[PDB]
Write a protein that binds this ligand. Structure first.
Ligand code: HEM
Length: 84
């Protein structure tokens, strides 16, 4: 039973205390990654709660970073929130 979030709840996690992001319709808690993030600490906080999809793809991220993504996954965006 995969879990769901809602953009709204996602959005509440705009801090360093707790960092969430949405990439390709999956939510993540990046909280712990920041320090590891080769491209920056500030870039991500710059988009907490946000759907950085467009952003992360516009910076080109590798398959390796993609794979890294799997460890910070917390769920997917609510279907009803999915934008089709
Ligand atoms: C969990 C989310 C993210 C993960 C796991 C991740 C991972 C990585 C990794 C592994 C690299 C180094 C080389 C590569 O694999 O391409 C990298 C570089 C970088 N990423 Fe991220 N990234 C994430 C989110 C973002 C976002 C949202 C942005 C922009 C808003 C961003 C901007 C950058 C920049 C600027 C660099 C390095 C400088 C450059 O290559 O231009 N990253 N990231």
């Amino acid at each position: 039973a995969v879990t769901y979030y809602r953009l709204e709840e996602v959005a509440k996690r705009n801090t360093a205390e707790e960092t969430w992001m949405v990439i390709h319709g999956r939510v993540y808690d990046i909280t712990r990654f920041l320090s590891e993030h080769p491209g920056g600490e500030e870039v991500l906080l710059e988009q907490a709660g946000a759907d950085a999809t467009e952003s992360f793809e516009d910076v080109g991220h590798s398959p390796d970073a993609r794979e890294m993504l799997k460890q910070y996954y917390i769920g997917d965006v609510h279907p009803n929130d999915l934008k089709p």
